[PDB]
């Protein structure tokens, strides 16, 4: 269940504060569909990037890795 | 050609990852020449497609889609005479960590390659050093960015992300940090944190 | 549970991706009590297995699979007294750069990994800095390690590899020139040159 | 995904290398190799070679033949 082809990180982090939240997941229609919905539901104070890996980008530590789409949601609104 | 076979690209591959622009303006203009909504919705469709390719993740090099957030900060802090393509060259900005720049320079030689060696420092030095280079397939497409890091610059690049930037300091403040790294004096961030809490109380 | 969450991986993925042996041998004992041309016949599938998982390429992390011929030369080197799992225990090696040390020493309170820590030169000092991980199943599945630097000693480490393979393997030489990196004297391998020579002649 | 299959003589810097597809066609591809340049060359699969200095400098070719020419003349 863990090998699910090649994956991203989608990243939701507020520009002046450090930290991100960040979420494994397959790059596509439904991630980007979502990525473009969440960003209007947060605003343009909070980023949502997509990454390779948080091991090439140390500007997004401390990561806080989330387990699903909704934990994201919840978890990014917060920031 | 050596450093893109290394990287796993190919003028191809940059070719189809290239996005062309629905706006009928040329990106050799500055920002007083479009409209920022216009500009905005755009972005927001290119982070969308940017978003969809599984291509991006099989190749042998990392990458990060740029947000719209970031975009509108940018527009709102370049308008109106900063050139387009010089503003919006980095949705898809590839990063590459090595142990030289040798390599990277020679790509000056492609005629749709634009290289800013910023391995000596920029004009305005702030402590960054690495090397970027654009890939443009014409003046109505996106340029896409490769950002080269020695592992010694990047390890500074990344400090100086998490306890210098954006927190209202000088940018003189970042070059008198990089000449404490390049002296021996900061081997970790907090260090970094340590000399930059003397340096601002000092100033 | 950080740092391999950091690297996409988990106990799970370790343990689907541990080879087990079937030379009805514990790899608790030494190479003595094992026969040369099984072993390397062994490893041989072992290395073909590696070079047959898509899943190692979808990982977010580098990796290598060594070959037959230096399994070979390592059986022949650490033969007879060496114990098998501190031999074969990098036959699938992943490579990783850690934020700080830190969040890889959180890793020794996993009951199947045992962590060597170089990062601090405290044992045979050659100027190598890191610390390698390495994931055993149990006495009779291959191990798996994971090699973790900081940028700053990856940096240094590979200058030295450089400089080891020209002049040839000098333990105190490395050591010292670990000295002169920390204290800002060697910024490239150009530098490190102009160091050594200042070394040499000063002796 | 792919990843790199990389030839090299251990005691000589620089390699041989060609991007290809992890599965049986090229692992039994390089077991072959392996057993017809014998074991003073070394065979190994890498992610990507700007993971791995210790292969420079890359000589890359672009297909399973050119790679076992260029692989037995090291």
């Known amino acids: ?79 | 050609m050596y450093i893109l076979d290394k990287i796993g690209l190919n003028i191809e591959i940059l070719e189809s990852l290239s996005y062309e622009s629905k706006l009928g303006m040329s990106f050799k203009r500055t920002l007083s020449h479009f409209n920022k909504e216009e500009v905005l919705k755009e972005i927001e469709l290119i982070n969308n497609w940017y978003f969809s390719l599984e291509i991006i993740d099989d190749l042998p090099l990392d990458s990060r889609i740029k947000s719209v957030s970031s975009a509108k900060m940018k527009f709102e802090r370049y308008y109106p005479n900063a050139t387009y393509n010089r503003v919006f060259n980095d949705i898809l900005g590839f990063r590459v960590i090595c142990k030289s720049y040798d390599e990277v320079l020679e790509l000056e030689k492609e005629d749709k390659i634009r290289v800013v060696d910023m391995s000596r420092g920029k004009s305005n030095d702030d402590g960054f050093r690495g090397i970027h280079v654009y890939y443009q397939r014409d003046n109505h497409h996106y340029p896409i960015e490769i950002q080269f890091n020695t592992y010694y610059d990047r390890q500074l690049n990344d400090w100086l992300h998490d306890k210098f930037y954006k927190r209202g300091y000088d940018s003189s403040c970042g070059q008198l940090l990089r000449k404490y790294y390049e002296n021996g004096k900061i081997k970790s961030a907090e260090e970094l944190e340590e000399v930059l809490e003397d340096v601002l109380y000092h100033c």
Do not use: H, W
């Open chain 1, 1 to 79: 269940l863990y090998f699910q082809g090649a994956m991203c990180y989608i990243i939701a982090k507020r520009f002046k504060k450090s930290g991100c939240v960040a979420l494994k997941a397959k790059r596509g229609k439904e991630l980007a569909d979502f990525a473009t919905d969440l960003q209007k539901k947060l605003g343009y104070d909070i980023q949502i990037v997509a990454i390779t890996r948080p091991t090439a980008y140390g500007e997004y530590e401390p990561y806080k890795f989330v387990n699903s789409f909704e934990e994201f949601s919840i978890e990014a609104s917060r920031l």
